[PDB]
């Protein structure tokens, strides 16, 4: 096409599928990679990629190359180092082979880096864009196949920790590459300098693969089990997956075992219902369009054309799928809808894992609130055994025990950069006003000072903060539950070979991990209270904590209405329940951890650098239970007047064109106007500094001009100053029919698809508005259709691909 983008993938069509059609491609993707081919490609792609940054660094402020240069997020000659010790040893730097063909495209990356810059980033696109793509499937394959370590040792060229989102941030690298000036033919130069690298990748493959040359119902009664947990797998997951699932059964008085689909024919399903209390769980994993995986074909294919009769058969399932695909979680959607035809019962709620987010933590939910659905569908309310076990440590020095920090012993007190997750920087609170002027919601706006912390950021950046509980929360749940809060202890896991030593940083005292380590205000979940069951005296109340427990019947009505909806909190429960009196040590054992919570970051970095702006809105709701609930992260820095917060930054993919004439279309009703602030900040600040800045147009929505009206004489000014071109206000509260974004950006129709397409402006859209970003985005799929004349169908493929070049970014919340 035109855009460079389009170019380089239409261009690259067939060098891109023969490329992954070579013979080691090809084996890698079945699983077939081996170690030493392995080796071997890691020391050339270690050649290759220390050639390729060279060259990057030195042409990193040239303008043929300058908007590219991403080395904190996509560099890899580090990560390739550690695993070139990993894989040929501590004296890796003279045991490497250098191939010919490796030295051959290490050439061509230098005669391109030495003379030819232009053409730099035909390489990039071939190698950094690959990287983003298959790797993360790649990392899994080499994982399973090879049996490395789940630490990532050996695998450290396919993690980018700087990288959240890999789909956003290729999107933005697009962007960056339309940005490019050059002329036509310089253009098509560089699409053949891309197919120049994917065949030199080609011939690197070639030359790598030249130098290579019983009836499972009868078994459980001989073996005396009572669970059996198929699994469904292709790179390993489900299979870890029902690995745990099974071995937690002899660890709660049951017995299981998990077991592969493959060799076993589904058809003693049916012998089943001959065990006393048994059941059978799925864990099972979708390819394809929606196909199951070739270990579970048979299974499959048999659950067409079948009629064997399952009565009186116990089974669970949990699916291993993507939302990004259109047939989600077919493949366990499919085995728990039939085998519910056939006969059997479902036990537990089907789970629908997605691998777009945290596959992980949905596992775990799964699985956490799985187990007491069955010990209480079963009856075999026999209490399972603990995981953690309290050690007091009743005389011991206070500089060996956490006093609340995250990382390291007495990392809050020693700090030292890198600052992230694990290793916060206390940042000294110096604002906090209130931009609400009416008394609706309390709107606040924070400051934090990062001045010495060595921590960069840009604008649209996110910062996320540790927060503590309300201190009166901690108080009364110590009292109502009388013990002493001040003990310091620890818990340690006797599962020997799981390196989860505690639950949270120990040792510790139990006020320090209920303000700093755990939740205590979101609505507990079922494992707990099935736990807390054996610890009320009243057999209304034990009864009424067993019966919360089942996922089916009305004790899923008890526990949606009465906990979920109600919003009751640990102490609402304690409090309703006084039957309740368990011990403290189980509770922290029980309760899930304190998570971080994040927000948008308000301000430029070229214009604040030592300081990080916050936009937030208090959380502060009557719940349906009396009491009144209270957001952690809102109320803890509410209470923060001029007072340390620990915050740590991590990277998004919301930027700022990187030409300065490039417009800008902003879209934030409401604290989505929080990283646009920033924005404008930067923007006027490029017009001080004299350069030449596009049109900056900003769409932001409130409910009344006198109430959330927020940053108000800060927009007035910069509108004011010629910054900010155009203040489109939508009050949504100020007469009889509400007015949104949506519709000033309808009236704009013509200026904006003017902007769009003779511009070539970027859009954003903002904030926490439900249902809002689906407005915006058919709003802008009607103006595209209505000036540039299309079809509704090219309207919205125009928009989408917008997105693909990274012209349309969002960043909504809840
Ligand atoms: C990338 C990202 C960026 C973000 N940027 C911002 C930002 O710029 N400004 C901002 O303010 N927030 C932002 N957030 C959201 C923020 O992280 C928190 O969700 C929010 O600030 C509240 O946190 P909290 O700890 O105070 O409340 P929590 O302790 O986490 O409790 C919140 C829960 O309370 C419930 N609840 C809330 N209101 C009610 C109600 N009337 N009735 C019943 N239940 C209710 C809801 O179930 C809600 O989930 C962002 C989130 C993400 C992921
Ligand atoms: C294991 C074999 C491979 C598979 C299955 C694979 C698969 C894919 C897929 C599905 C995409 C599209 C993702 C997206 O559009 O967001 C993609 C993109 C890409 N792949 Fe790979 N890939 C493989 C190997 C390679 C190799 C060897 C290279 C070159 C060194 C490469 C370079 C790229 C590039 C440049 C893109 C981006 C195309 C674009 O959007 O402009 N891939 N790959
Ligand atoms: C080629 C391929 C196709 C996939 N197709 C789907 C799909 O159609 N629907 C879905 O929900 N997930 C799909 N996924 C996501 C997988 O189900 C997900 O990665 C899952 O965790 C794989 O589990 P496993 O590691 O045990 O094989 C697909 C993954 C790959 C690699």
């Given at each position: 096409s035109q855009?460079l983008?389009?170019?380089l993938?239409?261009?690259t069509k067939?060098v891109?599928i023969?490329?992954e059609?070579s013979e080691?491609?090809?084996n890698?993707q079945?699983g077939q990679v081996?170690?030493?081919?392995?080796k071997?490609?890691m020391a050339s792609?270690?050649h290759?990629?220390?050639?390729?940054?060279e060259?990057?660094?030195?042409?990193?402020?040239?303008?043929?190359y300058?908007?590219?240069?991403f080395?904190?997020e996509l560099?890899?000659?580090?990560?390739?180092?550690?695993?070139m010790?990993?894989?040929?040893g501590?004296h890796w730097?003279?045991?490497?082979?250098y191939t010919?063909?490796?030295?051959h495209?290490?050439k061509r990356l230098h005669?391109?880096?030495?003379?030819?810059?232009?053409?730099?980033?035909?390489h990039a696109?071939?190698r950094?864009l690959?990287?983003?793509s298959?790797?993360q499937?790649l990392?899994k394959?080499?994982?399973?196949?090879?049996?490395?370590?789940?630490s990532?040792?050996?695998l450290?060229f396919?993690?980018?920790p700087?990288?959240?989102?890999?789909?956003?941030?290729?999107?933005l690298?697009?962007?960056?590459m339309?940005?490019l000036?050059?002329?036509?033919?310089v253009?098509?130069r560089?699409?053949?300098?891309a197919?120049?690298?994917?065949?030199?990748?080609?011939?690197?493959?070639?030359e790598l693969?030249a130098?290579?040359?019983?009836?499972?119902?009868?078994?459980?009664?001989?073996?005396g089990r009572?669970?059996?947990?198929?699994?469904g797998?292709?790179?390993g997951?489900?299979e870890?997956?029902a690995?745990?699932?099974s071995?937690?059964?002899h660890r709660?008085?049951?017995?299981?075992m998990?077991?592969?689909?493959?060799?076993?024919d589904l058809?003693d399903?049916?012998?089943?219902?001959?065990?006393?209390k048994?059941?059978?769980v799925?864990?099972?994993?979708?390819?394809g369009?929606?196909?199951?995986?070739?270990?579970?074909?048979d299974?499959?294919?048999?659950?067409?054309?079948?009629?064997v009769?399952?009565?009186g058969?116990?089974?669970?399932?949990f699916?291993?799928?993507?939302?990004?695909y259109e047939?989600?979680?077919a493949?366990?959607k499919?085995?728990?809808?039939?085998?519910?035809?056939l006969?059997?019962?479902?036990?537990?709620e089907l789970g629908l894992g997605?691998?777009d987010?945290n596959?992980?933590?949905?596992?775990?939910?799964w699985?956490?609130?799985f187990?007491?659905?069955?010990?209480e569908?079963?009856?075999?309310?026999?209490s399972s055994?603990?995981?953690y076990e309290?050690?007091?440590?009743e005389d011991?020095?206070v500089a060996?025990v956490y006093?609340g920090?995250?990382?390291?012993?007495?990392?809050?007190?020693?700090?030292?950069?890198?600052?992230?997750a694990?290793?916060?920087?206390?940042?000294?609170v110096?604002?906090?006003?209130?931009?609400?002027?009416?008394?609706?919601?309390?709107?606040?706006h924070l400051?934090?000072?990062?001045?010495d912390?060595?921590?960069?950021?840009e604008?649209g950046?996110?910062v996320a903060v540790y927060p503590?509980?309300?201190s009166?929360?901690?108080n009364?749940?110590?009292?109502?539950?009388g013990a002493d809060?001040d003990?310091?202890?620890?818990?340690?896991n006797l599962?020997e070979?799981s390196?989860?030593?505690?639950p949270?940083?120990?040792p510790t005292?139990?006020?320090?991990?209920?303000?700093?380590?755990?939740?205590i205000?979101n609505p507990?979940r079922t494992?707990?209270?099935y736990?807390?069951?054996?610890?009320?005296?009243?057999?209304?109340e034990?009864?009424?904590?067993?019966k919360?427990?089942?996922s089916?019947?009305?004790?899923?009505?008890?526990y949606?209405?009465?906990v979920?909806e109600?919003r009751?909190?640990?102490?609402?429960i304690?409090?309703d329940?006084?039957?309740?009196?368990?011990?403290?040590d189980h509770?922290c054992?029980?309760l899930?951890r304190?998570?971080?919570?994040?927000?948008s970051?308000?301000?430029?970095?070229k214009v604040?650098?030592?300081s990080?702006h916050?936009?937030?809105?208090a959380?502060?709701?009557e719940?349906?239970?009396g009491?009144?609930?209270?957001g952690?992260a809102t109320?803890?820095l509410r209470?923060?007047?001029?007072?340390?917060?620990?915050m740590?930054?991590?990277?998004?993919?919301?930027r700022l064109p990187?030409k300065?004439?490039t417009?800008?279309?902003?879209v934030?009703?409401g604290?989505?106007?929080?990283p646009?602030?920033?924005?404008?900040?930067?923007?006027?600040?490029?017009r001080?500094q004299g350069?030449?800045?596009?049109?900056?147009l900003?769409?932001?929505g409130?409910?009344?001009?006198?109430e959330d009206?927020?940053?108000?004489?800060e927009?007035?000014?910069?509108h004011?100053?010629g910054?900010?071109?155009?203040?489109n206000v939508?009050?949504?509260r100020?007469?009889?029919?509400?007015?949104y974004?949506?519709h000033?950006?309808?009236?704009?129709?013509?200026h904006?698809?003017?902007?769009?397409?003779?511009g070539?402006?970027?859009?954003y859209?903002?904030?926490?508005?439900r249902?809002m970003?689906?407005?915006?985005?058919?709003?802008?799929?009607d103006?595209v259709?209505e000036?540039?004349?299309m079809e509704?169908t090219q309207?919205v493929?125009?928009?989408?691909?917008?997105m693909?070049?990274?012209?349309?970014s969002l960043?909504?919340?809840?």
């Open positions: 855009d983008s389009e170019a993938k239409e261009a067939e891109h023969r490329a059609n080691f491609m090809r890698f079945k081996s170690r030493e081919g392995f071997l490609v792609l270690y290759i990629y220390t050639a390729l940054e060259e990057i660094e030195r042409n990193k402020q040239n303008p043929v300058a908007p590219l240069y080395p904190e560099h890899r000659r580090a990560a390739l180092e550690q695993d010790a990993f894989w040929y501590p730097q003279e045991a490497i082979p010919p063909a490796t030295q495209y290490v005669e391109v880096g030495g003379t030819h810059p232009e053409l730099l980033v035909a696109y071939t950094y690959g990287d983003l298959g790797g499937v990392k394959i080499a994982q399973k196949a090879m049996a490395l370590p789940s990532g040792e050996g450290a396919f993690t980018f700087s990288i959240d989102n890999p789909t956003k941030f290729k999107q690298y697009r962007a960056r339309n940005t000036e050059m002329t036509p033919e253009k098509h560089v699409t053949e300098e197919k120049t690298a994917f065949l030199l990748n080609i011939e690197l493959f070639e693969q130098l290579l040359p019983s009836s499972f119902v009868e078994k459980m009664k001989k073996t009572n669970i059996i947990v198929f699994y797998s292709q790179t997951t489900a870890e997956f690995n745990r699932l071995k937690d059964a709660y008085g049951m017995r299981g998990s077991a592969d689909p493959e060799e076993y058809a399903l049916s012998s089943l219902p001959e065990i006393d048994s059941l059978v799925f864990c099972m994993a979708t390819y369009e929606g196909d199951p995986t070739d270990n579970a074909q299974f499959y294919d048999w659950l067409q054309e079948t009629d009769d399952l009565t058969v116990k089974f669970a399932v699916g291993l799928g993507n939302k990004t047939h989600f979680n493949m366990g499919y085995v728990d809808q039939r085998l519910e035809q006969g059997a019962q479902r036990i537990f997605d691998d987010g596959l992980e933590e949905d596992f775990i939910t699985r956490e609130q187990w007491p659905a069955v010990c569908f079963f009856g075999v309310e026999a055994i603990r995981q309290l050690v007091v440590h011991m020095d060996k006093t920090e995250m990382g390291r012993l007495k990392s809050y007190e020693n700090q030292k950069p890198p600052f992230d694990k290793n916060p920087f206390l940042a000294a110096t604002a906090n006003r209130k931009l609400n002027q009416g008394t609706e919601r309390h709107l606040m400051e934090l000072d990062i001045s912390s060595k921590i960069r950021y604008s950046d996110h503590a509980n309300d009166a929360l901690v009364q749940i110590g009292e109502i539950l809060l003990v310091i202890m620890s818990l340690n599962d070979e390196n989860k030593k505690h949270f940083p120990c005292t139990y006020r320090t991990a209920l303000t700093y380590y755990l939740d205000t507990p494992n707990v209270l736990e807390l069951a054996q610890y009320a005296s009243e057999p209304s034990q009864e009424h904590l067993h919360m427990a089942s089916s019947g009305e004790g899923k009505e008890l949606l209405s009465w979920v109600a009751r909190h640990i102490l609402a304690l409090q329940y006084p039957s309740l009196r368990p011990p403290i509770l054992e029980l899930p304190l998570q971080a919570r994040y927000y970051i308000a301000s430029s970095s604040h650098p030592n990080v916050i936009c937030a809105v959380v502060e709701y719940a349906k239970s009491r009144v609930n209270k952690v109320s803890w209470a923060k007047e001029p007072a340390l917060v620990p740590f930054v991590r990277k998004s993919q919301f990187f300065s004439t417009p800008v279309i902003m934030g009703p604290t989505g106007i929080a646009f602030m920033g924005f404008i900040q930067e923007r006027a600040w490029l001080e350069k030449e800045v596009g049109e900056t900003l769409y932001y409130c409910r009344r001009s006198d009206y927020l940053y108000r004489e927009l007035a000014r910069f004011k100053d910054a900010l071109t155009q203040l939508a009050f949504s100020e007469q009889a029919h509400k007015v974004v949506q000033l950006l309808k009236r704009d129709r013509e904006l698809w003017k902007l769009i397409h003779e070539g402006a970027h859009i859209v903002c904030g926490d508005a249902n970003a689906k407005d915006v985005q058919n709003t802008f799929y103006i259709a000036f540039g004349p509704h309207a493929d125009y928009v989408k691909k917008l693909t070049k990274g012209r349309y960043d909504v919340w809840s």
